[PDB]
Short mmCIF file of C-alpha atoms in Angstrom, two decimals:
data_model
loop_
_atom_site.label_atom_id
_atom_site.label_comp_id
_atom_site.label_asym_id
_atom_site.label_seq_id
_atom_site.Cartn_x
_atom_site.Cartn_y
_atom_site.Cartn_z
CA UNK A 1 85.00 133.13 109.63
CA UNK A 2 81.67 131.75 110.87
CA UNK A 3 81.24 135.36 111.90
CA UNK A 4 84.39 137.27 113.00
CA UNK A 5 86.49 135.14 115.42
CA UNK A 6 88.75 137.03 117.82
CA UNK A 7 91.09 134.17 116.91
CA UNK A 8 90.10 132.96 120.36
CA UNK A 9 89.03 129.42 119.11
CA UNK A 10 91.26 126.38 119.71
CA UNK A 11 93.95 125.12 117.24
CA UNK A 12 96.49 122.61 118.82
CA UNK A 13 99.09 120.03 117.51
CA UNK A 14 102.93 120.70 117.03
CA UNK A 15 103.91 124.43 116.94
CA UNK A 16 106.91 125.69 115.19
CA UNK A 17 108.50 129.17 115.26
CA UNK A 18 111.55 130.66 113.53
CA UNK A 19 92.78 145.90 112.03
CA UNK A 20 95.48 143.29 112.52
CA UNK A 21 94.54 141.94 109.09
CA UNK A 22 98.03 143.26 108.41
CA UNK A 23 98.68 139.62 109.31
CA UNK A 24 96.58 138.62 106.28
CA UNK A 25 98.36 141.01 103.90
CA UNK A 26 101.61 139.44 105.12
CA UNK A 27 100.08 136.09 104.29
CA UNK A 28 99.27 137.12 100.72
CA UNK A 29 102.76 138.54 100.40
CA UNK A 30 104.29 135.21 101.48
CA UNK A 31 101.78 133.54 99.19
CA UNK A 32 103.09 135.54 96.26
CA UNK A 33 106.76 134.97 97.05
CA UNK A 34 105.99 131.27 96.82
CA UNK A 35 104.09 131.80 93.59
CA UNK A 36 106.99 133.49 91.81
CA UNK A 37 109.57 131.10 93.28
CA UNK A 38 107.50 128.09 92.22
CA UNK A 39 106.80 129.37 88.71
CA UNK A 40 110.54 129.90 88.26
CA UNK A 41 111.23 126.30 89.20
CA UNK A 42 108.23 124.94 87.32
CA UNK A 43 109.49 126.94 84.36
CA UNK A 44 112.96 125.42 84.66
CA UNK A 45 111.32 122.00 84.20
CA UNK A 46 109.32 123.12 81.17
CA UNK A 47 110.11 124.15 77.61
CA UNK A 48 110.54 127.93 77.18
CA UNK A 49 108.10 127.77 74.32
CA UNK A 50 105.79 125.52 76.21
CA UNK A 51 102.54 126.68 77.77
CA UNK A 52 102.13 127.07 81.50
CA UNK A 53 99.18 127.54 83.81
CA UNK A 54 98.50 127.01 87.48
CA UNK A 55 97.05 128.53 90.63
CA UNK A 56 99.81 129.31 93.12
CA UNK A 57 97.07 130.16 95.59
CA UNK A 58 95.52 126.68 95.59
CA UNK A 59 98.94 125.04 95.90
CA UNK A 60 99.56 127.09 99.04
CA UNK A 61 96.05 126.26 100.19
CA UNK A 62 96.36 122.50 99.90
CA UNK A 63 99.78 122.54 101.55
CA UNK A 64 98.51 124.70 104.43
CA UNK A 65 95.85 122.02 104.86
CA UNK A 66 98.55 119.35 104.90
CA UNK A 67 100.66 121.37 107.33
CA UNK A 68 97.90 120.90 109.89
CA UNK A 69 99.02 117.36 110.76
CA UNK A 70 102.74 118.15 110.34
CA UNK A 71 105.39 118.16 113.09
CA UNK A 72 109.11 118.97 113.63
CA UNK A 73 111.29 119.44 110.53
CA UNK A 74 108.48 118.40 108.15
CA UNK A 75 106.59 121.31 109.66
CA UNK A 76 109.64 123.61 109.38
CA UNK A 77 110.32 123.19 105.70
CA UNK A 78 106.58 123.54 105.08
CA UNK A 79 106.35 126.90 106.87
CA UNK A 80 109.56 128.17 105.34
CA UNK A 81 109.11 126.79 101.82
CA UNK A 82 105.62 128.21 101.54
CA UNK A 83 107.07 131.38 103.10
CA UNK A 84 104.89 131.19 106.18
CA UNK A 85 107.95 131.98 108.33
CA UNK A 86 107.74 135.58 107.08
CA UNK A 87 104.57 136.45 109.00
CA UNK A 88 103.55 137.88 112.38
CA UNK A 89 105.05 135.37 114.80
CA UNK A 90 105.43 132.01 116.55
CA UNK A 91 102.31 130.10 115.58
CA UNK A 92 102.35 127.56 112.81
CA UNK A 93 98.76 127.29 114.06
CA UNK A 94 97.78 130.95 113.67
CA UNK A 95 98.67 131.14 109.98
CA UNK A 96 95.72 128.83 109.26
CA UNK A 97 93.65 131.53 110.94
CA UNK A 98 94.82 134.28 108.59
CA UNK A 99 94.62 131.93 105.58
CA UNK A 100 91.03 131.33 106.80
CA UNK A 101 90.46 135.09 106.85
CA UNK A 102 92.22 135.52 103.50
CA UNK A 103 90.22 132.82 101.71
CA UNK A 104 87.31 134.37 103.58
CA UNK A 105 87.47 137.78 101.97
CA UNK A 106 88.46 136.18 98.67
CA UNK A 107 85.60 133.75 98.28
CA UNK A 108 83.02 135.44 100.49
CA UNK A 109 81.93 138.55 98.59
CA UNK A 110 79.39 140.85 100.18
CA UNK A 111 79.60 142.44 96.70
CA UNK A 112 78.57 139.75 94.09
CA UNK A 113 80.68 140.82 91.05
CA UNK A 114 82.72 138.04 89.35
CA UNK A 115 82.69 134.34 90.23
CA UNK A 116 85.49 133.10 92.49
CA UNK A 117 84.66 130.02 94.56
CA UNK A 118 86.93 127.58 96.38
CA UNK A 119 86.25 124.25 98.05
CA UNK A 120 88.66 121.98 99.90
CA UNK A 121 88.19 118.38 101.04
CA UNK A 122 89.77 115.34 102.61
CA UNK A 123 89.31 111.74 101.51
CA UNK A 124 90.59 109.39 104.20
CA UNK A 125 90.62 105.59 104.25
CA UNK A 126 87.39 104.02 105.56
CA UNK A 127 89.38 101.72 107.86
CA UNK A 128 91.49 104.30 109.67
CA UNK A 129 90.77 106.24 112.85
CA UNK A 130 91.64 109.85 112.01
CA UNK A 131 92.40 112.40 114.72
CA UNK A 132 89.15 114.14 115.72
CA UNK A 133 90.77 117.52 116.41
CA UNK A 134 92.62 117.47 113.10
CA UNK A 135 89.46 116.49 111.24
CA UNK A 136 87.56 119.24 113.05
CA UNK A 137 90.14 122.01 112.52
CA UNK A 138 90.30 121.29 108.79
CA UNK A 139 86.54 121.65 108.49
CA UNK A 140 86.59 124.90 110.45
CA UNK A 141 89.61 126.68 108.93
CA UNK A 142 89.79 125.33 105.39
CA UNK A 143 86.19 124.04 105.41
CA UNK A 144 87.36 120.60 104.31
CA UNK A 145 85.03 117.74 105.24
CA UNK A 146 86.71 114.34 105.58
CA UNK A 147 85.02 112.09 103.01
CA UNK A 148 85.58 108.39 103.60
CA UNK A 149 87.13 106.47 100.70
CA UNK A 150 88.00 102.80 100.32
CA UNK A 151 91.69 102.92 99.34
CA UNK A 152 92.44 99.47 100.83
CA UNK A 153 90.15 97.66 98.41
CA UNK A 154 89.05 100.22 95.83
CA UNK A 155 91.78 102.76 95.13
CA UNK A 156 90.61 102.97 91.52
CA UNK A 157 87.04 104.12 92.17
CA UNK A 158 88.62 106.04 95.04
CA UNK A 159 90.66 108.02 92.51
CA UNK A 160 87.68 108.25 90.24
CA UNK A 161 85.75 109.53 93.24
CA UNK A 162 88.15 112.38 93.91
CA UNK A 163 88.69 113.44 90.32
CA UNK A 164 84.92 113.45 89.88
CA UNK A 165 84.28 115.58 92.98
CA UNK A 166 86.86 118.08 91.74
CA UNK A 167 85.33 118.17 88.28
CA UNK A 168 82.03 118.97 89.94
CA UNK A 169 83.73 121.83 91.81
CA UNK A 170 85.44 123.03 88.62
CA UNK A 171 82.36 123.29 86.43
CA UNK A 172 83.77 120.29 84.59
CA UNK A 173 86.92 122.25 83.76
CA UNK A 174 89.25 120.23 85.95
CA UNK A 175 89.41 116.46 85.37
CA UNK A 176 92.34 114.16 86.17
CA UNK A 177 94.19 115.84 89.02
CA UNK A 178 95.31 112.47 90.29
CA UNK A 179 97.14 110.42 87.67
CA UNK A 180 96.08 106.86 86.96
CA UNK A 181 98.39 104.92 89.36
CA UNK A 182 98.81 107.59 92.02
CA UNK A 183 96.51 106.20 94.70
CA UNK A 184 96.86 102.61 95.96
CA UNK A 185 96.04 100.19 98.79
CA UNK A 186 98.59 102.01 100.94
CA UNK A 187 97.04 105.48 100.50
CA UNK A 188 95.95 106.94 103.82
CA UNK A 189 94.62 110.40 102.99
CA UNK A 190 94.36 112.86 100.13
CA UNK A 191 94.08 116.57 100.89
CA UNK A 192 92.56 118.52 98.02
CA UNK A 193 91.85 122.06 96.93
CA UNK A 194 89.85 123.48 94.08
CA UNK A 195 89.39 126.98 92.80
CA UNK A 196 87.09 128.21 90.07
CA UNK A 197 86.89 131.61 88.42
CA UNK A 198 84.72 133.17 85.78
CA UNK A 199 84.72 136.88 85.05
CA UNK A 200 83.24 139.21 82.43
CA UNK A 201 85.56 141.76 80.85
CA UNK A 202 84.82 145.15 82.40
CA UNK A 203 85.18 146.15 78.71
CA UNK A 204 84.43 143.27 76.33
CA UNK A 205 85.84 142.62 72.88
CA UNK A 206 83.64 142.48 69.75
CA UNK A 207 83.37 139.10 68.02
CA UNK A 208 82.84 141.07 64.83
CA UNK A 209 86.23 142.72 65.21
CA UNK A 210 87.88 139.40 66.06
CA UNK A 211 89.86 137.93 63.17
CA UNK A 212 91.78 134.76 62.44
CA UNK A 213 95.55 135.15 62.13
CA UNK A 214 98.44 132.83 61.29
CA UNK A 215 100.62 131.61 64.19
CA UNK A 216 104.23 130.56 63.56
CA UNK A 217 105.63 127.85 65.85
CA UNK A 218 109.13 127.37 67.27
CA UNK A 219 109.54 124.64 64.67
CA UNK A 220 107.81 123.85 61.42
CA UNK A 221 104.42 125.24 60.62
CA UNK A 222 101.73 127.49 61.77
CA UNK A 223 98.39 127.09 63.26
CA UNK A 224 95.47 129.45 62.81
CA UNK A 225 94.56 131.70 65.72
CA UNK A 226 91.49 133.84 66.33
CA UNK A 227 93.01 137.18 67.26
CA UNK A 228 90.78 139.57 69.15
CA UNK A 229 90.66 143.33 68.91
CA UNK A 230 89.39 146.33 70.78
CA UNK A 231 90.46 149.85 71.62
CA UNK A 232 90.21 151.88 74.79
CA UNK A 233 91.65 153.28 77.96
CA UNK A 234 93.52 150.72 80.06
CA UNK A 235 96.14 150.74 82.80
CA UNK A 236 99.33 150.13 80.86
CA UNK A 237 103.03 150.86 80.82
CA UNK A 238 105.94 149.82 78.63
CA UNK A 239 108.48 148.91 81.28
CA UNK A 240 112.27 148.69 80.97
CA UNK A 241 113.78 146.95 77.94
CA UNK A 242 110.58 147.69 76.04
CA UNK A 243 108.59 145.23 78.13
CA UNK A 244 104.86 145.94 77.92
CA UNK A 245 102.47 145.48 80.82
CA UNK A 246 98.75 145.77 80.52
CA UNK A 247 95.87 145.24 82.87
CA UNK A 248 92.47 143.98 81.80
CA UNK A 249 90.08 144.40 84.72
CA UNK A 250 87.00 142.22 85.00
CA UNK A 251 83.63 143.69 86.04
CA UNK A 252 83.96 144.85 89.65
CA UNK A 253 87.58 145.91 89.10
CA UNK A 254 88.26 143.68 92.12
CA UNK A 255 90.00 141.09 89.93
CA UNK A 256 92.05 141.78 86.82
CA UNK A 257 94.13 139.83 84.36
CA UNK A 258 97.70 141.09 83.88
CA UNK A 259 99.50 140.34 80.66
CA UNK A 260 103.23 140.79 80.31
CA UNK A 261 104.99 140.71 76.99
CA UNK A 262 108.65 141.17 76.30
CA UNK A 263 109.99 143.36 73.49
CA UNK A 264 109.65 141.78 70.05
CA UNK A 265 112.33 139.17 69.65
CA UNK A 266 113.49 139.61 73.25
CA UNK A 267 113.65 136.57 75.57
CA UNK A 268 110.82 135.97 78.03
CA UNK A 269 113.11 133.80 80.12
CA UNK A 270 115.12 136.84 81.15
CA UNK A 271 111.77 138.12 82.40
CA UNK A 272 110.78 134.94 84.18
CA UNK A 273 114.24 134.76 85.75
CA UNK A 274 113.85 138.18 87.31
CA UNK A 275 110.15 137.76 88.07
CA UNK A 276 109.37 138.48 91.69
CA UNK A 277 106.67 139.86 93.94
CA UNK A 278 108.84 142.98 94.20
CA UNK A 279 109.28 143.34 90.45
CA UNK A 280 105.60 142.56 89.94
CA UNK A 281 104.48 145.25 92.36
CA UNK A 282 106.93 147.55 90.58
CA UNK A 283 105.37 147.24 87.09
CA UNK A 284 101.91 147.30 88.64
CA UNK A 285 102.85 150.52 90.38
CA UNK A 286 104.20 152.18 87.23
CA UNK A 287 100.93 151.51 85.37
CA UNK A 288 98.97 154.46 84.04
CA UNK A 289 95.62 155.17 82.40
CA UNK A 290 95.79 155.55 78.64
CA UNK A 291 94.13 155.01 75.33
CA UNK A 292 95.33 152.06 73.27
CA UNK A 293 94.51 149.21 70.93
CA UNK A 294 94.52 145.76 72.49
CA UNK A 295 95.17 142.67 70.41
CA UNK A 296 95.02 139.37 72.30
CA UNK A 297 94.20 135.91 71.04
CA UNK A 298 90.98 134.10 71.90
CA UNK A 299 92.17 130.81 73.41
CA UNK A 300 92.27 128.30 76.27
CA UNK A 301 95.05 126.32 77.95
CA UNK A 302 95.19 123.34 80.30
CA UNK A 303 98.26 122.60 82.41
CA UNK A 304 99.07 119.61 84.61
CA UNK A 305 102.04 118.36 86.62
CA UNK A 306 103.43 116.87 89.84
CA UNK A 307 104.64 119.40 92.45
CA UNK A 308 107.00 116.91 94.07
CA UNK A 309 110.08 117.42 91.93
CA UNK A 310 109.98 121.20 92.19
CA UNK A 311 108.99 121.43 95.86
CA UNK A 312 111.81 119.05 96.71
CA UNK A 313 114.20 121.46 94.96
CA UNK A 314 112.80 124.38 97.02
CA UNK A 315 113.26 122.68 100.41
CA UNK A 316 110.13 120.59 100.96
CA UNK A 317 112.10 117.35 101.32
CA UNK A 318 111.00 115.66 104.61
CA UNK A 319 107.34 115.70 103.60
CA UNK A 320 107.97 113.31 100.70
CA UNK A 321 110.41 111.10 102.66
CA UNK A 322 108.77 107.86 103.87
CA UNK A 323 111.56 107.79 106.43
CA UNK A 324 111.71 111.45 107.53
CA UNK A 325 108.06 112.43 106.97
CA UNK A 326 106.18 113.60 110.08
CA UNK A 327 102.38 113.90 109.88
CA UNK A 328 101.46 112.48 113.27
CA UNK A 329 98.37 114.66 113.66
CA UNK A 330 96.25 112.99 110.98
CA UNK A 331 95.43 109.42 112.00
CA UNK A 332 94.69 108.88 115.71
CA UNK A 333 94.69 105.08 115.37
CA UNK A 334 95.16 102.81 112.33
CA UNK A 335 97.92 103.00 109.70
CA UNK A 336 100.84 105.25 110.68
CA UNK A 337 104.20 106.26 109.12
CA UNK A 338 102.56 108.64 106.64
CA UNK A 339 104.35 110.60 103.92
CA UNK A 340 103.29 112.49 100.78
CA UNK A 341 103.68 110.03 97.90
CA UNK A 342 103.21 112.91 95.48
CA UNK A 343 101.16 116.03 94.81
CA UNK A 344 99.37 117.05 91.65
CA UNK A 345 97.95 120.17 90.12
CA UNK A 346 95.93 120.98 87.08
CA UNK A 347 94.69 124.30 85.77
CA UNK A 348 92.56 125.54 82.91
CA UNK A 349 92.28 128.93 81.31
CA UNK A 350 89.94 130.22 78.64
CA UNK A 351 89.74 133.72 77.21
CA UNK A 352 87.20 135.28 74.87
CA UNK A 353 85.26 138.39 73.92
CA UNK A 354 82.90 138.12 76.91
CA UNK A 355 85.47 137.63 79.70
CA UNK A 356 87.77 135.00 81.15
CA UNK A 357 87.39 131.60 82.81
CA UNK A 358 90.03 129.63 84.72
CA UNK A 359 90.04 126.72 87.16
CA UNK A 360 92.58 124.70 89.07
CA UNK A 361 93.04 122.11 91.77
CA UNK A 362 95.76 120.60 93.92
CA UNK A 363 95.84 117.11 95.34
CA UNK A 364 98.31 116.07 98.01
CA UNK A 365 98.13 112.28 98.37
CA UNK A 366 99.36 110.47 101.49
CA UNK A 367 101.46 107.30 101.19
CA UNK A 368 100.59 106.22 97.64
CA UNK A 369 102.35 105.65 94.28
CA UNK A 370 104.99 108.25 93.38
CA UNK A 371 105.18 109.34 89.73
CA UNK A 372 105.75 128.84 69.96
CA UNK A 373 105.95 132.54 70.99
CA UNK A 374 104.86 133.09 74.62
CA UNK A 375 103.74 135.93 76.91
CA UNK A 376 102.89 135.98 80.68
CA UNK A 377 99.42 136.05 82.26
CA UNK A 378 98.17 136.84 85.76
CA UNK A 379 94.84 136.81 87.60
CA UNK A 380 95.14 138.81 90.78
CA UNK A 381 92.72 139.82 93.52
CA UNK A 382 93.75 143.47 93.74
CA UNK A 383 92.29 144.46 97.07
CA UNK A 384 93.73 141.28 98.62
CA UNK A 385 97.12 141.25 96.82
CA UNK A 386 96.72 137.61 95.85
CA UNK A 387 97.86 135.94 92.65
CA UNK A 388 95.00 133.48 92.03
CA UNK A 389 96.24 132.16 88.70
CA UNK A 390 99.33 132.66 86.58
CA UNK A 391 101.08 131.15 83.59
CA UNK A 392 102.56 131.76 80.16
CA UNK A 393 100.61 131.62 76.90
CA UNK A 394 102.74 130.09 74.16
CA UNK A 395 100.16 128.74 71.69
CA UNK A 396 96.82 130.46 71.07
CA UNK A 397 96.02 127.96 68.32
CA UNK A 398 95.30 124.92 70.49
#
């Protein structure tokens, strides 16, 4: 951004290779393929009846930041895993450009509708000499200023410093991205991303009409749930196997939630197993204006988890290997031999008669300490083809 760069600015350090915004659309595409693939995996590691919420977008946005200082294999798996190897061509360095155009259109609205604001940031060790170019590129592309932190003698407050910053950037919604013993005296850097959304229903529900129901859990007893109610014309479509798909657009119609609910008594897993950018575009394409009666619970969910286990299973292995990890572009002089000790994510969703609110954050930490009847949800940026948030609502009660 800054204005409209002819992608003429500089952008060195280790390059891998396997109206041109078509490059950006390709980015979003690859961003989505990662989203679905990750959810699948994440799902595998969670209980089918368990809740789920995240922001695939942020995860790809913190890892793109990390990729900046990557080299060789570590760079390969990063580009491939996050699907960056499906874009225009030879330039592990150019992707950051598109992702800086993408986030640009996303968060920079010459239109003002709903709230969608991101904010990245680095937190390096006060003793180290970080690469100037790396530090400068990050601030330009991802707009991430390198905030000095005392990990060598104050990892605790250092953690507390990061979590706090994030909270600030998540309207208090996100808190505890970095677990208690994550960061330590050996921690070099900690790349972070935050995303915050708040949108008013283009067609709001009526609190009056809302009514408390009785929710039966996978085991034992219920839990009361405030079920909402409204009626109107919405883009909908009962897809194959009786699967329903509905789209609730927020004011501006630029961003809309997308619920997906399998036929009564049918398994959602079968739906999550065959979930894919392709399939998703399919349902979304088959949608059609109609009159209906929408019933959806008034609730909020908060997810949290380490991305290490899953990302390892997808291919991002070298990055977490103290031995094989290659992030030579970060510290110019000081502590070397860096590797991602672990990565964390945390998302929050809230839904009510007035609209929806959701927030998330991802924290990649360098060299530290390692370690109910559902329905699907989606928060997409239509014009941009990006899945901002996603998840599965399994307990409205909460």
